[PDB]
Amino acid sequence: DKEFQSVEEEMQSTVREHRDGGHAGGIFNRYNILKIQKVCNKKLWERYTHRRKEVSEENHNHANERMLFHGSPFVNAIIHKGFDERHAGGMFGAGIYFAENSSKSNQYVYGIGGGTGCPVHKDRSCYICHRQLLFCRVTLGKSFLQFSAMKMAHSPPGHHSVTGRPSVNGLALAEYVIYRGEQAYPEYLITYQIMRP
């Protein structure tokens, strides 16, 4: 399957060396991809496409959709109930955060800063336990570009998302923030392990 090889390639090629030396997400240069499942939730898909059409109409007939990663200990709840801003602290406030680098999303799979790592071994660098990440369709619409912390409750006026851009004093890598759960669809569920270098 070419569609699934495309997802594996995005997962592998977007890995970066992290500033925390692997503290949050573990030490690795690549993953062992175990499974890639396409999520088919009709109710969530229509909530997503309905919002996407509204955003496109408010953004010069352009949804500004991107495929982005999301790491969370609550992936199962997300694939069933969708993203939920009511469950959203954060550099850009009360939003739902996505990354274009899979290894950045991997830092959130076991909690903020990697939490205490895997449930079985309490290891943020566990090579044994299988992890899950989502590869999502995200509607950014008119995205507000920001470099420094800007604690928002909602998108800035006239905007549909916030894009955090890398800066000397700030972010190492980009991040994308939405403030309405219906602006993302959890399209692929990736089951994987981080691999020992």
Ligand X SMILES: Nc1ccc2oc(=O)ccc2c1I
Judged by CB, which is closer to ligand X: 31, or 98? 98
Quick check: 97 binds ligand X (CB under 6 A)? yes
The number of angstroms, rounded, from the C-alpha of 168 to the middle of its chain's C-alpha atoms is: 23
Contact 164, 146 (CB under 8 A): yes
Contact 109, 132 (CB under 8 A): yes
Task: Single out the residue of 186, 193, 146 nearest to residue 12, CA to CA.
Answer: 193
- Ramachandran angles phi, psi of 136, nearest 5°: -115, 150
Quick check: 159 binds ligand X (CB under 6 A)? no
136 binds, among ligand X, Zn ion, none (CB under 5 to 8 A by kind): none
Tokens of 90: 């954060």
Quick check: 184 binds ligand X (CB under 6 A)? no
Judged by CB, which is closer to Zn ion: 118, or 138? 118
126 is annotated as contributing to ligand binding:
yes
- Among 64, 105, 132, 143, indicate the residue that binds ligand X (CB under 6 A): 105
- β strands within the chain, DSSP E: 31-38, 65-70, 96-98, 131-139, 143-146, 161-164, 175-178, 184-194
Quick check: 69 binds ligand X (CB under 6 A)? yes
- Among 28, 48, 108, 135, indicate the residue that binds ligand X (CB under 6 A): 108
118 binds, among Zn ion, ligand X, none (CB under 5 to 8 A by kind): Zn ion
Stretch 109-138: interaction string toward Zn ion, x if CB under 5 A:
---------x-xx----x-xx---------
Per CB under 6 A, residues contacting ligand X are 69-72, 90-91, 97-99, 104-105, 108, 175
